Amino acid sequence: DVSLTPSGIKVNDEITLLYPALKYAEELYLLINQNKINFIKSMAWPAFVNNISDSVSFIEQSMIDNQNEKALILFIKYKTKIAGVVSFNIIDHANKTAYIGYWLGANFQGKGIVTNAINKLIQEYGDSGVIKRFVIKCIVDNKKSNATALRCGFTLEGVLQKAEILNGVSYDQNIYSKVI
Ligand SMILES: CC(C)(COP(=O)(O)OP(=O)(O)OC[C@H]1O[C@@H](n2cnc3c(N)ncnc32)[C@H](O)[C@@H]1OP(=O)(O)O)[C@@H](O)C(=O)NCCC(=O)NCCS
Ligand SMILES: CC(=O)N[C@@H](CC(=O)O)C(=O)N[P@@](=O)(OCCCN)OC[C@H]1O[C@@H](n2cnc3c(N)ncnc32)[C@H](O)[C@@H]1O
Question: Which of 15, 18, 22, 23 has the greatest number of beta carbons closer than 10 A?
Answer without folding.
Answer: 15
